[PDB]
Design a protein around this ligand. Structure first.
Ligand SMILES: *[C@@H]1O[C@H](CO)[C@@H](O[C@@H]2O[C@H](CO)[C@@H](O[C@@H]3O[C@H](CO)[C@@H](O)[C@H](O)[C@@H]3O)[C@H](O)[C@H]2NC(C)=O)[C@H](O)[C@H]1NC(C)=O
Ligand SMILES: *[C@@H]1O[C@H](CO)[C@@H](O[C@@H]2O[C@H](CO)[C@@H](O[C@@H]3O[C@H](CO)[C@@H](O)[C@H](O)[C@@H]3O)[C@H](O)[C@H]2NC(C)=O)[C@H](O)[C@H]1NC(C)=O
Ligand SMILES: *[C@@H]1O[C@H](CO)[C@@H](O[C@@H]2O[C@H](CO)[C@@H](O[C@@H]3O[C@H](CO)[C@@H](O)[C@H](O)[C@@H]3O)[C@H](O)[C@H]2NC(C)=O)[C@H](O)[C@H]1NC(C)=O
Ligand SMILES: *[C@@H]1O[C@H](CO)[C@@H](O[C@@H]2O[C@H](CO)[C@@H](O[C@@H]3O[C@H](CO)[C@@H](O)[C@H](O)[C@@H]3O)[C@H](O)[C@H]2NC(C)=O)[C@H](O)[C@H]1NC(C)=O
Ligand SMILES: *[C@@H]1O[C@H](CO)[C@@H](O)[C@H](O)[C@H]1NC(C)=O
Ligand SMILES: *[C@@H]1O[C@H](CO)[C@@H](O)[C@H](O)[C@H]1NC(C)=O
Ligand SMILES: [Fe+3]
Ligand SMILES: [Fe+3]
Lengths: 348, 348
């Protein structure tokens, strides 16, 4: 079996996948599922081979025995002659975002506000913010800390999914895939920009990438950077330019995960695949571009220069980092998770 | 060893072979095996010398180091003046064939349909259709694409062998030799003519050759040309008369293969052998006709005028054509093969 079966989450990621298969000549093929946890189960079960996960989902995959393969790398500030595949990975900035018009909304005034999230169990939209909120309150009532939220993945009949809009017919409310209007980085931002929520937990890069006409989709083009403000742990409301000291935490990059037995092969294929269809690649933009999806961060983030290597075969722990592992572990004492609990025997 | 040891597949091909031996005065003799792969292994091992293979089987033979010797060549409409052994080869038309009666079955609704095939790994019955289906779906789960199939050679306990009937006691279900009821071109057709399947992947010529009493065997004689029809890649359902732009792909002719050292010998013996017992032959029909097989396409196709030479020194690649070689290679990224793996190994 020399093909690598990519798991796509939802029809958008699935149609991109379909193309990737065709252009790579079935070097890559596609399994599909509604949610990322379903895909993690597909990879567990041998019906798929690999997928690109947010660090939060990498915690779950690693609890189920999967390992990381290749990290994402995005344009750096240091500017290095070292090649993208060899350049050290940077992290990204998890930040809270508000409309500047809503004054008097600081860190310490978030209770009973409407919040927007990428999805449940992701790093910027959930793990870091909710972990911090639980730490301060001394309470596991993250479910009742906000009046309403949109957090795809949560209990669909809960208040954490009250704000999620579904697709366009309004169906599949709060499924954690891009079919949902407010899924993901982009979706949490949109959720804020149409003021369905008061704060959005995203990354630094989302704010710039969707403001000042960088996205010429409906909601986004008209958006404006100065109308938005980064809440800090201190209690301030700084502008987006001040992200380097107004960030909630530093988040490990979305990385590819696979089973151990299939790791080295998947890496191989992917290293070559990005040569063919990556940023500066032979068939990019002729036949297919792997890291470009028309602003929907499909399969990978759109701002991915390339997939960088890692040192050795790292575990999910080494990759994510002892301290982020602990922050996650602690947030998860507040909440049992089916996939996590079914797998919990693998690490005892 | 001036004898050419022909490999026969099944007792049916074996008993025709036997006669061919006797009349040719042991200029040719017979080895036997259950399947075509087994015969290719006999040629590898020096235990046989040559046999006539479908283009798909020629790819496998070529991965194991065998070379083509003489193509089959069929009654043409054009050129027709250069003698048969010197006439350029034309290819053949791989087509999908359905009962006309079954409306609402085009190309794009073949999922969950019942399929009939010549055998696994052949050009018209397997490689071209499945290759396209895998390309369309972006998925290597071709085994689960059709509800049931008959594809001799597949895992006999699988669903791709569910429909195959065996011989007459029903034994040897789904072995890819003519003793199984739905093996080969003819066998795929019949699988349709008795509606055990909904589509059959065969060549143009099979359709005419079994309809309108062109065959006076049981199932075939009563057939009508217009009760069967050809699905197109566009999605149409045009007549068999319309084969020329409702063809799935162009198929390289069934060719004889041998080991590389024995090629030039086998050629001469065969060119002389067809002079003796061929279409236009001194001992045909008197004592033996090499290209007539009791309507069972034994050893060679029945519509074979003769064996034509090949241009230059061809590899299995050159003969089949750079593009169909790739169509095969990709479909085989979805499936490991024992003989191919042993040959990817031992010859290197
Ligand atoms: C699909 O995946 C295959 C498998 O990796 C890719 O084919 C491989 O790519 C190149 C193109 O010929 C070959 O690599 C080179 O081989 C030669 C030795 O002859 C040498 O320059 C280097 O050692 C280098 O590795 C390799 O032979 C080839 N593999 C096969 C089996 O042909 C292919 O590029 C991928 N295509 C797409 C569209 O994804
Ligand atoms: C927060 O996210 C934004 C958006 O990704 C980051 O800004 C981006 O930073 C890179 C590197 O600093 C910029 O590239 C630089 O731009 C100049 C063009 O003047 C170019 O010559 C250099 O080669 C260099 O790559 C990039 O333009 C910029 N993106 C946008 C949309 O402005 C920012 O660095 C992040 N902030 C923190 C604190 O990490
Ligand atoms: C089996 O194969 C051998 C070939 O190796 C056949 O032997 C050949 O038999 C013919 C006579 O039938 C000989 O032909 C000669 O041709 C010239 C014309 O250029 C003529 O002048 C001679 O008088 C003679 O007719 C030929 O020499 C001979 N070849 C060998 C190598 O001995 C044999 O007939 C084949 N038998 C069957 C049943 O296939
Ligand atoms: C699809 O397959 C059918 C059957 O294999 C092809 O029809 C056959 O075509 C040959 C050559 O065109 C015909 O031979 C002709 O016979 C007549 C005598 O009646 C003669 O006038 C011509 O000189 C030529 O020799 C043959 O009769 C015909 N067979 C049948 C049963 O109709 C057809 O050409 C194939 N079409 C495509 C597009 O591949
Ligand atoms: C089949 O794959 C080819 C490349 O091998 C691609 O160009 C084509 O688009 C694929 N088929 C379809 C229906 O897209
Ligand atoms: C809160 O602070 C940090 C989380 O940022 C954590 O290390 C610490 O254990 C927590 N303690 C309490 C009492 O919440
Ligand atoms: Fe993330
Ligand atoms: Fe064939």
């Amino acid at each position: 079996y020399t093909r690598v079966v990519w798991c796509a989450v939802g029809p958008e990621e699935q149609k991109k996948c379909q193309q990737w298969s065709q252009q790579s000549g079935q070097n890559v093929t596609c399994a599909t599922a509604s949610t990322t946890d379903d895909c993690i189960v597909l990879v567990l079960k041998g019906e798929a081979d690999a997928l690109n996960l947010d660090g939060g989902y990498i915690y779950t995959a690693g609890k189920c025995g999967l390992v990381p393969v290749l990290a994402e790398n995005r344009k750096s500030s240091k500017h290095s002659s070292l090649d993208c595949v060899l350049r050290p990975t940077e992290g990204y900035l998890a930040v809270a975002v508000v409309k500047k018009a809503n004054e008097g909304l600081t860190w310490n005034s978030l209770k009973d506000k409407k919040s927007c999230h990428t999805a449940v169990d992701r790093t910027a939209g959930w793990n870091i913010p909710m972990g911090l909120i639980v730490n301060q309150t001394g309470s596991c009532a993250f479910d009742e800390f906000f009046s309403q939220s949109c957090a795809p993945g949560a209990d669909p009949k809960s208040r954490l999914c009250a704000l999620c809009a579904g697709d366009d017919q309004g169906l599949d409310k709060c499924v954690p895939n891009s079919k949902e209007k407010y899924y993901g980085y982009t979706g949490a931002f949109r959720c804020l920009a149409e003021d369905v929520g008061d704060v959005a937990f995203v990354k630094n890069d989302t704010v710039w990438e969707n403001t000042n006409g960088e996205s010429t989709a409906d909601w986004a083009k008209n958006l404006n950077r100065e109308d938005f403000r980064l809440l800090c742990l201190d209690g301030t409301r700084k502008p987006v330019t001040e992200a380097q000291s107004c960030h909630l935490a530093v988040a490990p990059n979305h990385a590819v995960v696979s089973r151990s037995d299939r790791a080295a092969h998947v890496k191989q294929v992917l290293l070559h695949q990005q040569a063919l269809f990556g940023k500066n690649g032979k068939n990019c933009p002729d036949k297919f571009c792997l890291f470009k999806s028309e602003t929907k961060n499909l399969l990978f983030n759109d701002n991915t220069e390339c997939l960088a290597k890692l040192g050795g075969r790292p575990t999910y722990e080494e990759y994510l980092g002892t301290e982020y592992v602990t922050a996650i572990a602690n947030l998860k004492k507040c909440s049992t998770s089916p996939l996590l609990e079914a797998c919990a025997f693998l690490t005892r």
